[PDB]
Amino acid sequence: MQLSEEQAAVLRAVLKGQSIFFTGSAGTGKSYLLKRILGSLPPTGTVATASTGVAACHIGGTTLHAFAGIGSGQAPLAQCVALAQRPGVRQGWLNCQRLVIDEISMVEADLFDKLEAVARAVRQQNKPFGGIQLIICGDFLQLPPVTKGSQPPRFCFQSKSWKRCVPVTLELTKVWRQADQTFISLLQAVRLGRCSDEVTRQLQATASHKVGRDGIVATRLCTHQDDVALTNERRLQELPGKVHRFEAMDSNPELASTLDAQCPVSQLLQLKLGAQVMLVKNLSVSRGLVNGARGVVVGFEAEGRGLPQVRFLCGVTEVIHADRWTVQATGGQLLSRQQLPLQLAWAMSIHKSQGMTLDCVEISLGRVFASGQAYVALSRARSLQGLRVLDFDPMAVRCDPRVLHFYATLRRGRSL
Amino acid sequence: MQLSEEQAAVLRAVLKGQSIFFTGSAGTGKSYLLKRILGSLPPTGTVATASTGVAACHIGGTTLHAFAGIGSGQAPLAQCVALAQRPGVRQGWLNCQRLVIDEISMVEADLFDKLEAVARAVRQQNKPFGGIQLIICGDFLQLPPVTKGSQPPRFCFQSKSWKRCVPVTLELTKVWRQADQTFISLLQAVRLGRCSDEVTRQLQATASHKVGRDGIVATRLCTHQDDVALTNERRLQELPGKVHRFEAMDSNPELASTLDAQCPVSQLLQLKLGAQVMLVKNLSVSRGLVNGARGVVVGFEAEGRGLPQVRFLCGVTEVIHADRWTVQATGGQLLSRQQLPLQLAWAMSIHKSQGMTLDCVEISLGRVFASGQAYVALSRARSLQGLRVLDFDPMAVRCDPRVLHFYATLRRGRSL
Ligand SMILES: Nc1ncnc2c1ncn2[C@@H]1O[C@H](COP(=O)(O)OP(=O)(O)NP(=O)(O)O)[C@@H](O)[C@H]1O
Ligand SMILES: Nc1ncnc2c1ncn2[C@@H]1O[C@H](COP(=O)(O)OP(=O)(O)NP(=O)(O)O)[C@@H](O)[C@H]1O
Ligand SMILES: [Br-]
Ligand SMILES: [Br-]
Ligand SMILES: [Br-]
Ligand SMILES: [Br-]
Ligand SMILES: [Br-]
Ligand SMILES: [Br-]
Ligand SMILES: [Br-]
Ligand SMILES: [Br-]
Ligand SMILES: [Br-]
Ligand SMILES: [Mg+2]
Ligand SMILES: [Mg+2]
């Protein structure tokens, strides 16, 4: 694809060796541009990471936690430095010339501070972040920071080292995920916490949307995985068909926990006729069989493993064959899982949707959400006709004042 | 694709739980059928192997050496059992219910005997091969057995435990790789050591073949990698263009040797305008961009890494982007390499062609070759007009008498 002028400016800064933060609304092509950046660089000395396993998958990277190799990051700095000096971990720190981080908004400032300090200590380079070229992107108006500790987290930009570490800031301002300017304008009002009467009426009108197709119902977006598991298990149980089982094969079952964070499929996949499923690997972009595609199980092959036949929203029916995930864990340890690329999809967490495009979703937005969380949910949908919002109330839409102040300081001095 | 009656009979035997050896000429779909078998089985308890790294890649498996975890296999049986009892190796032995082995002809009888004894000792199951369902294929009239020792190797069928371990034998007899019955008939005469006057005249006539296309020359097949390296290096040096470098990124540089056995690309790929290259990953079966495809470097992109533009024999010109190989080493350890899927291809070893289809080849066959080695070289070509044989003489075509006796015993009692 033709990069926009804005995307080309970011790639030019990266190839000049500039540390950069680039930002933009949901669906502006940040993660796409990271893939193009990675393609444009030598793989030696280039580390691709994201804040979360879900986001790391999108760019073929690892988690920032796995790269860093400092445990949780909560131990004292001396303990974290000793962990980073372990065989494998240390060579990763020493060999890293360029560190890509997607979905920065989930990285708390105290962790950024720890990583900056470990980088200097392991590399014995007394410069910001040990001299590593940082290539960071995300949207601070999307999912907020998380912490392995118990204190209220600070946004990454609050780190006293942030601006020294990413001195260049560029923006991507053209939304590609949604094609419809009416929906783009609605989403921007939500992102900024500006729900006019018109915006609220337009979101409430979606309560009547018939988002599915024959036999395909909406995926409910939920704030917590407990509620997702409960819903998917109950809806599967209620189907009359016999259960069909597909067991995953893992290279390292003792590290299942580490592999699950980054892999979107389960050790045990159970299906029935009528099961609502999400495809979680690109199979055929031309046929619309893409990551996030929704369908319904319409049959099982008679032969062999009895693989499922899935009809998708686009109208294509396909037998779904095995696939594989390889996850980079601590040091450079690699883990694999072989499984069908399907998950049950009556429900899905907002966190697990991070960075995805979806097209058949429902969400209840009648209570207080975390800063950015309602915006992330709404901005997954490719079009309004694939979105059903129940009980919408701008109480759900919250923007942390720290983030609005941050973006005002970013804007200061710019033409627009 | 519709399996033949013969292929379906092998898959039926496998799904009944029968240990089996299935055999056939070059290009009869043995490795294809193994992929279909693997697709029809649960991945848990199913181990995909081949005798060589080259052959393991074709089926997405590991080497038999890597799975077994007994070192070279030359140590005493007690030391081999202790090696197989290591953490990770032992669980692979205990968890294995079905063991697939492609290209069995390279497995010497003494190693088969050691593996059968290790299987019983580690699993504490006093039945052939520890009770593992064996799914074995190959062609004993192809590449002969190799040994990590210094004694003349025995063919795998000479093992005293061979027939007890694979009690069922089935054949695939329809060649698919070549479509031309003239060429199929010539190849069968070579396989059986039956070079009539007419067979030798037809092979000698190919000395005049123009096998290339504009700017594309034949890959010379060589018996030894020393001669391949020398030829590819000298031909690259002689080109006038500046050198372009592409350095691989390996998860584990300390196990490069382990990764190279299975990976068809180098740590350092050097290219020039005019370089003769082989694509070594499927990119587009649709457009003829398949494993083994030959082309010529016609340009380098101006942007980013300066990726190569390659024109292939089929007429397609494509920019060649990074790819990745993941290799399963001992005890479930996974290794990766990121590199462009190109190798220099003025020359290639016969051993590295094992199990491949090629389209643009030359071979000098005026020397004594190993049993099956001339047949393997000749049977890589999809068609005769992609093959140039220099100095052909039947002295090059040898069939080990042990193998002809084995196949006579296999045939005994059959209808045909
Ligand atoms: N230059 C471009 N022209 C057209 N489509 C583009 C371009 N760049 C990106 N896209 C498309 O934009 C869509 C969204 O890209 P993506 O990389 O997910 O954006 P993002 O900013 O990372 N989204 P999010 O993670 O939700 O904030 C993808 O389907 C791309 O195919
Ligand atoms: N049933 C089939 N119908 C048509 N083509 C087939 C069929 N089975 C296999 N093929 C084709 O046969 C070709 C050769 O298959 P392959 O699996 O390489 O054979 P092989 O017996 O393993 N060859 P070799 O390893 O050289 O002895 C492939 O291109 C397949 O596409
Ligand atoms: Br410049
Ligand atoms: Br609001
Ligand atoms: Br609906
Ligand atoms: Br979820
Ligand atoms: Br609600
Ligand atoms: Br001993
Ligand atoms: Br002969
Ligand atoms: Br010569
Ligand atoms: Br010769
Ligand atoms: Mg993204
Ligand atoms: Mg084969």
Residue numbers in the entry:
A (entry chain A), B (entry chain B): 205 to 620
What do the authors say?
Pif1 is a multifunctional helicase and DNA processing enzyme that has roles in genome stability.
The structures we report are of constructs from residues 206–641 (apo hPIF1) or 206–620 (the structures with nucleotide analogues bound). R584 also shifts in position to interact with the ATP γ-phosphate, fixing the α13 helix (domain 2A) relative to the ATP-binding pocket, while Q346 from motif III coordinates the ATP γ-phosphate. Importantly, this conformational rearrangement of the 1A–2A inter-domain linker (W380 and R381) during nucleotide binding causes a significant ∼4 Å shift of the N-terminal end of the α9 helix, which in turn induces a structural rearrangement of the 2B domain.
